[PDB]
Design a protein around this motif. Structure first.
Motif, PDB file in Angstrom:
ATOM      1  N   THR D  11     -12.894 -26.337  -0.089  1.00 20.25           N
ATOM      2  CA  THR D  11     -12.122 -25.193  -0.557  1.00 20.25           C
ATOM      3  C   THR D  11     -11.010 -24.881   0.431  1.00 20.25           C
ATOM      4  OG1 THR D  11     -12.190 -22.796  -0.872  1.00 20.25           O
ATOM      5  CG2 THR D  11     -13.946 -23.778   0.447  1.00 20.25           C
ATOM      6  N   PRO D  12      -9.768 -24.706  -0.016  1.00 20.50           N
ATOM      7  CA  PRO D  12      -8.711 -24.302   0.918  1.00 20.50           C
ATOM      8  C   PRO D  12      -9.078 -22.995   1.600  1.00 20.50           C
ATOM      9  CG  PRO D  12      -7.790 -24.939  -1.195  1.00 20.50           C
ATOM     10  CD  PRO D  12      -9.259 -24.838  -1.391  1.00 20.50           C
ATOM     11  N   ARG D  14      -8.581 -19.448   3.521  1.00 15.23           N
ATOM     12  CA  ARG D  14      -7.718 -18.285   3.595  1.00 15.23           C
ATOM     13  C   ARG D  14      -8.595 -17.111   3.991  1.00 15.23           C
ATOM     14  NH1 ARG D  14     -10.164 -20.760  -0.985  1.00 15.23           N
ATOM     15  NH2 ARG D  14     -10.826 -19.076  -2.383  1.00 15.23           N
ATOM     16  N   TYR D  15      -8.016 -16.150   4.704  1.00 14.96           N
ATOM     17  CA  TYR D  15      -8.820 -15.023   5.160  1.00 14.96           C
ATOM     18  C   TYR D  15      -8.050 -13.727   4.978  1.00 14.96           C
ATOM     19  CZ  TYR D  15      -6.077 -15.532   9.468  1.00 14.96           C
ATOM     20  OH  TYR D  15      -5.055 -15.642  10.382  1.00 14.96           O
ATOM     21  N   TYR D  16      -8.796 -12.647   4.786  1.00 14.51           N
ATOM     22  CA  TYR D  16      -8.185 -11.360   4.496  1.00 14.51           C
ATOM     23  C   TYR D  16      -7.334 -10.883   5.663  1.00 14.51           C
ATOM     24  CZ  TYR D  16     -10.811 -10.505   0.203  1.00 14.51           C
ATOM     25  OH  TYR D  16     -11.321 -10.567  -1.072  1.00 14.51           O
ATOM     26  N   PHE D  17      -6.260 -10.180   5.326  1.00 12.35           N
ATOM     27  CA  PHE D  17      -5.352  -9.585   6.292  1.00 12.35           C
ATOM     28  C   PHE D  17      -5.214  -8.112   5.953  1.00 12.35           C
ATOM     29  CE2 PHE D  17      -1.194  -8.634   8.175  1.00 12.35           C
ATOM     30  CZ  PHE D  17      -1.399  -9.135   9.438  1.00 12.35           C
ATOM     31  N   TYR D  49      -5.307 -15.228  12.866  1.00 15.11           N
ATOM     32  CA  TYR D  49      -6.123 -16.270  13.467  1.00 15.11           C
ATOM     33  C   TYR D  49      -5.517 -17.630  13.166  1.00 15.11           C
ATOM     34  CZ  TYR D  49      -9.765 -12.716  14.009  1.00 15.11           C
ATOM     35  OH  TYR D  49     -10.475 -11.590  14.354  1.00 15.11           O
TER      36      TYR D  49
END
Lengths: 548, 132, 48, 49
Positions: D11-12, D14-17, D49
Motif C-alpha cells: 500500500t502506498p 501516507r500519514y495524517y498532517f 516525517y
C-alpha cells in the motif's frame, strides 16, 4: 550560639548531565520568612456563612458557606513552580526536556530571629524593636501526614517567587464537617428555596491539633531545623503535547487524484464514491465509509457536562473536567470550562508596584487538543438516512427540557472504556507541583491541579508559630485573652527540590515550537525603573509527540 | 456596636429630584441586604426598596417604581436612594434598615435557614417633604 | 452436572469430610468512612 | 493478499498532517449555510516525517 549563623543562603539551579540523555535538575530556593504572633492561642471553630448572597434567587453558584477549624499555626508551603524556577530555567527545561520526574525534596530553617516591639507612651507615639535572645519559634513537621493536607497553591498562599523579596507563611485552617442543603433557583423563581445550614454530623467530627499529633521543636536564635530528604514515587510527567484527535489516527485514505498546481484551493480528491469505498466501520447498517464514520482504535478525550454543579452533604460544587475547550487557541474569548484560571497577587507574579485589591488573573489554554467543541457535536437516529431530517437529529441548537439556552451537550457524557486522555500540564509560576492521593478505596485516575500525584506519601506540611511571650500579670483562670508581649520572628527557609529529566530528540524535519524572549514580551522578564517585577505565565508542553 | 445614619431629608419642590444617603458603620454592611422604608406622619410603615449584598438585584414598591433608584457603594460603605420625580405622597420619614437574611432554627442557633420579611437593625431616619 | 465435574465422596455414619485450608488474595477492607466531599478538600479560605 | 498463489501489492504510504476544521451540524431544512471552513494548520503541531 547567638552570633554564629546556622546555614547559608542558596537559590541556585543546577543541571547535572548524566548518561543516556538524562539530566539531574537541582532547584534550590531560599527565602526570608516573616511571621507575626498569632491572633489568639486558642483554636477556633468558625462557621462562614454567605446566606445573604445565596438568598438572591439564581445565585446558588456563589455559595461560600462552610465550617472550619482556625489554628494558631502558620503553614510554610513551597508546593508551587514559581518558588523553584525563574523564567530562564523554565525556558531551558521546556525547550530542551521531554519528560520530568520528581525525585526528592528537603527543607530546613536557619538563622532564627525573634524580636519584640516596645511602644512608648510618649505623646508622639514611638516604637522600638528590641531582640529577645530567649524567645522560641515552635516548628512542627508532620512527617506522618497526620494532619489534613492543605496545598496553598490553590489559594495563591505559597511562598514568594522572588528570592530577594521577603515572604510570609499562611495561617493554617482546615475544614470542619458540616451539613448544608441548598435547593437551586433562578431569577424570577417564586419564594425562598430550601437554603439551610444543618450543623454537624457527630459521626464525622474531627478536631486535629498540632500539639497532640506532631512533635514540636523549640528553636531559639541559635538553633536550626532540617526535615531531611523525602523521595517521591510519582509517575513521570511529559513536557510534550498531543495533537492527533480521532480524525488523525491511523492510515489516511489513498488519494486517487493528487493536485497538479500549487495554491491553497488546489485540493486533492479521494475519487472513490463514499458508498463504494473499503475499510471498517462500527456502523453495521450503513454502506458509507468516511473520515467521520471510519473505525478508530479508541476515543481521544471525552465529553462531560460543562458548568455542572452537583450537591452533597456539604452543598454544591462544580463538576471538574480533565480537558480544555476546543478551538480556544484561535479565539481566547471562547476559553471556557476545563481551562484553569489562576488569580494571584504581588507575591506570586503580579507587578509588585501595582495598587489596589484587584488580583492578576490568567486563563491557561493548554496546547494539547484533547478537548471537545460541543457546538460541532450532534446525535442522529440509528437508521442513518442522509441527509438527516429534522426529527432524526438532535443538535446543539436544540432546546433540552424546554430551555432555549441549554442543549444536550450540557448533560452529555462520553467517558467510556475506550476513553484516553492526558495528565494536566504544569502551570508556571503558580501551578502546583505535587498533590496527595486520596485515601479512598478506588482512587481517581488523575488530579486536575498537579502533574505529580503521591502514591504512598509525600513531605509532611511544615508549621511554624511564635511561642507565647507572657507578661507578669498572667492569670490562666481569667476568661479574657492571654496577655502577650508583641513578638515577631524572621527566619530563613531553604529548600532543595530534585527532578530528573530526559533531553528531547528531534524526530522530524521541521523545527518545533519554543519559548523565546521577543519585542512584545521583552519587559516582563526585567525589573522596572522603580524595582517592579512580574512573573508572567508560560506554557510547558511546546513540543509535539505522536499519539499513535 | 455600629449603627446606620440617614441624611439628605428636607422639604423640596414637587416634581424635583433628591438623593438620600445612609451611612453604615460596622463590618456587616458589605454582607447585609439593605432596605429603605418610609413612614408617613401617623401612618403605617411602608416598604420602599431592597438591594442585596452584591447589588445583584433591586426591588421596589409600585408606588416608587420608576421613580426611586436604590444603590450602594461598599468602597464608601454607604447606601443611596435617588428620589427622582418627587410627588406629594413622598412626604414622610425615611429609614434605612437591614433585612435579616439568616434565621437560626434551634434557639441556640446550631442550624440556620434563609428567609425574608424581618428587618434586623434600623437607622436614625430623615424627614422629607414635598411642597412649594 | 455435579456428577460429571466434581469427585463425589460417599460418607457413611462414621466418615468425615474436610476441605483443607483455603487462602484468600483479596484487598483490605476499611472499617472507617470518609466524610469529606468536594466542598471539604484542601485549604479553606482565610477569614479576614 | 490472503491467497498464497496470488501475487500482492504494497500500500502506498501516507500519514495524517495536522489540520483545523470547523463544521457546525445541520439538518435538511436548516436555513442558510452552516459554518463549514478549513482553518489551516496550527504551527504548534506540524510534524513532517
Amino acid at each position: 550560639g547567638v552570633g554564629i549563623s546556622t546555614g547559608t543562603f542558596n537559590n541556585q539551579t543546577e543541571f547535572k548531565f548524566l548518561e543516556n540523555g538524562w539530566v539531574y535538575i537541582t532547584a534550590n530556593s531560599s527565602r526570608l520568612v516573616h511571621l507575626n504572633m498569632p491572633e489568639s492561642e486558642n483554636y477556633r471553630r468558625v462557621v462562614v456563612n454567605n446566606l445573604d448572597k445565596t438568598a438572591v434567587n439564581g445565585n446558588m453558584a456563589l455559595d461560600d458557606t462552610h465550617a472550619e477549624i482556625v489554628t494558631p499555626w502558620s503553614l510554610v508551603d513551597a508546593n508551587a513552580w514559581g518558588v523553584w524556577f525563574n523564567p530562564g530555567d523554565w525556558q531551558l527545561i521546556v525547550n530542551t526536556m521531554s519528560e520530568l520526574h520528581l525525585v526528592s525534596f528537603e527543607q530546613e530553617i536557619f538563622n532564627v530571629v525573634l524580636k519584640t516591639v516596645s511602644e512608648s507612651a510618649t505623646q508622639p507615639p514611638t516604637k522600638v524593636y528590641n531582640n529577645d535572645l530567649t524567645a522560641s519559634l515552635m516548628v512542627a513537621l508532620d512527617s506522618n501526614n497526620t494532619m489534613p493536607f492543605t496545598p496553598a497553591a490553590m489559594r495563591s498562599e505559597t511562598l514568594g517567587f522572588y528570592p530577594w523579596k521577603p515572604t510570609i507563611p499562611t495561617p493554617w485552617r482546615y475544614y470542619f464537617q458540616w451539613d448544608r442543603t441548598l435547593i437551586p433557583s433562578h431569577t424570577g423563581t417564586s419564594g425562598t428555596p430550601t437554603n439551610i445550614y444543618h450543623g454537624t454530623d457527630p459521626d464525622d467530627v474531627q478536631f486535629y491539633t498540632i500539639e497532640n499529633s506532631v512533635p514540636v521543636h523549640l528553636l531559639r536564635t541559635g538553633d536550626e531545623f532540617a526535615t531531611g530528604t523525602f523521595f517521591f514515587d510519582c509517575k513521570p510527567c511529559r513536557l510534550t503535547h498531543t495533537w492527533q484527535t480521532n480524525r488523525a489516527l491511523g492510515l489516511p485514505p489513498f488519494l486517487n487524484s493528487l493536485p497538479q498546481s500549487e495554491g491553497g484551493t488546489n485540493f486533492g480528491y479521494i475519487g472513490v464514491q463514499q458508498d463504494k469505498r473499503r475499510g471498517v466501520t462500527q456502523m453495521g447498517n450503513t454502506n458509507y465509509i468516511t473520515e467521520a464514520t471510519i473505525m478508530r482504535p479508541a476515543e481521544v478525550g471525552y465529553s462531560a457536562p460543562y458548568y455542572s454543579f452537583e450537591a452533597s452533604t456539604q452543598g454544591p460544587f462544580k463538576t471538574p473536567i480533565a480537558a480544555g475547550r476546543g478551538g480556544a487557541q484561535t479565539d481566547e474569548n471562547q476559553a471556557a470550562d476545563g481551562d484553569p484560571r489562576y488569580a494571584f497577587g504581588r507575591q506570586h507574579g503580579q507587578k509588585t508596584t501595582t495598587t489596589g485589591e484587584t488580583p492578576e488573573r490568567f486563563t491557561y489554554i493548554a496546547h494539547q487538543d484533547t478537548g471537545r467543541y460541543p457546538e460541532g457535536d450532534w446525535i442522529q437516529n440509528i437508521n442513518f438516512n442522509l441527509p438527516v431530517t429534522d426529527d432524526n437529529v438532535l443538535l446543539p441548537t436544540d432546546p433540552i427540557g424546554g430551555k432555549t439556552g441549554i442543549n444536550y451537550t450540557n448533560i452529555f457524557n462520553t467517558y467510556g472504556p475506550l476513553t484516553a486522555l492526558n495528565n494536566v500540564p504544569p502551570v508556571y509560576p503558580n501551578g502546583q507541583i505535587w498533590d496527595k492521593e486520596f485515601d479512598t478505596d478506588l482512587k481517581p485516575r488523575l488530579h486536575v491541579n498537579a502533574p505529580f500525584v503521591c502514591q504512598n506519601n509525600c513531605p509532611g506540611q511544615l508549621f511554624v508559630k511564635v511561642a507565647p511571650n507572657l507578661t507578669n500579670q498572667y492569670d490562666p483562670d481569667a476568661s479574657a485573652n492571654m496577655s502577650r508581649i508583641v513578638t515577631y520572628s524572621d527566619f530563613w527557609w531553604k529548600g532543595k527540590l530534585v527532578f530528573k529529566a530526559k533531553l528531547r530528540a528531534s524526530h522530524t524535519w521541521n523545527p518545533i515550537q519554543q519559548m523565546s524572549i521577543n519585542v512584545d514580551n521583552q519587559f516582563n522578564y526585567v525589573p522596572s525603573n522603580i524595582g517592579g517585577m512580574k512573573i508572567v505565565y508560560e506554557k510547558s508542553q511546546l513540543a509535539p509527540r505522536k499519539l499513535y | 456596636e455600629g449603627q446606620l445614619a440617614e441624611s439628605g431629608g428636607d422639604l423640596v419642590k414637587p416634581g424635583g429630584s433628591l438623593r438620600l444617603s445612609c451611612v453604615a458603620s460596622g463590618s456587616t454592611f458589605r454582607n447585609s441586604h439593605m432596605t429603605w422604608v418610609r413612614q408617613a406622619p401617623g401612618k403605617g410603615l411602608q416598604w420602599v426598596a431592597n438591594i442585596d449584598s452584591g447589588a445583584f438585584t433591586t426591588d421596589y414598591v409600585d408606588a416608587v417604581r420608576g421613580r426611586f433608584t436604590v444603590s450602594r457603594d461598599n468602597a464608601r460603605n454607604t447606601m443611596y436612594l435617588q428620589m427622582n420625580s418627587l410627588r406629594a405622597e413622598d412626604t414622610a420619614v425615611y429609614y434605612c434598615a437591614t433585612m435579616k437574611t439568616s434565621y437560626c432554627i434551634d434557639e441556640n442557633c446550631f442550624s440556620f435557614q434563609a428567609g425574608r420579611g424581618v428587618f434586623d437593625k434600623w437607622g436614625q431616619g430623615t424627614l422629607v417633604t414635598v411642597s412649594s
